[PDB]
Subunit: 203 residues, 2 copies
Amino acid sequence: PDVEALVQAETIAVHAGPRPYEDQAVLGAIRAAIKGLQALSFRYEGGSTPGRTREVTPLGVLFGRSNYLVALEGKGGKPRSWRLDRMSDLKVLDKPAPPPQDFSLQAFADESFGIYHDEIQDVVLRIHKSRAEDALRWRFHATQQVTPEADGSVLVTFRAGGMRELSWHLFTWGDAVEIVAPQVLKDMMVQELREAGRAHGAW
Amino acid sequence: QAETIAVHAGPRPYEDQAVLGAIRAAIKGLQALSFRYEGGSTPGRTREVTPLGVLFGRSNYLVALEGKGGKPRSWRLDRMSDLKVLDKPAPPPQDFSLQAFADESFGIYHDEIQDVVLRIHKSRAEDALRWRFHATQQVTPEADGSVLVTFRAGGMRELSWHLFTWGDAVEIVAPQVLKDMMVQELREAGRAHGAW
């Protein structure tokens, strides 16, 4: 697999700065369930039925600042991401739960910057010349294409879901990023900026 | 494929997979690691270290110590090259913790250490209780259901970026430098994106 995932799974790498409290016992239960080809049950403090017990076929773990279990809930259910920081009362069931042989975990991981895989967006950004070199060493997405423009800017294009999380990241680029598309990313960014600007007394 | 781990999509630095592989092999084998280090005091010099772990973030770092009795410190992955796993013993210090290093003073950040005081609105208080802002943090319920979060840390720039992810649910009580930074970044990004 990706070495970036490997070193985090092995606790050789940590994400600096604020992040969820996460219990290594939860990861151990998931790994044991996957290794044994067994079903996994847990209490999920999220979604419509908070505190309810869910039984899933676990498929893998997505590693990042927050970690996610990818799993199918019930025959006919789709691959879905569950945040590890909302999972408790893990039980490795004494029941076989074979995964599909077509599913690509790393393909699934790249569909979205967030929890939901609903609408993939065609994202187009323009990074101003002052940050252009940084942009050339920056991994926005696995699918990205970077194009130098005539004035020293770089265009960055990629396809992904998860616009809220992406707009949080774009804040870190300051005034050096222009959002070219999609409109929903512009509107999300502007609404978040107005909310936070009012709250902090920026204007 | 039998793939059971993956990296969540998230914008992040380019990272040389070979470099992480060499660091991981050195750490698992309890072996020393050598590399050319760009910049710093002796640019381009070959350094030999006891490797300890990796930090992901705004930039990626090796955590490692140099020389007998050396103190753990950070090295930028993007200034490292010519990695070699050596056949010398390099066990970690008996008291070393990667997560503690991640939170320790001047481990990666260079600004002044601040007393951070935040108030988080009731609508996100449950989330704040399950959130690890810093190892030194204390969270205190207020009578109106909000929570107070206090901690002592550097890295105000990175912290202000993270606070943007809490929206209108976080009030910065202190330090003033964090307030000012937050406001300046909001005004700049707001003007750039057309929000005011």
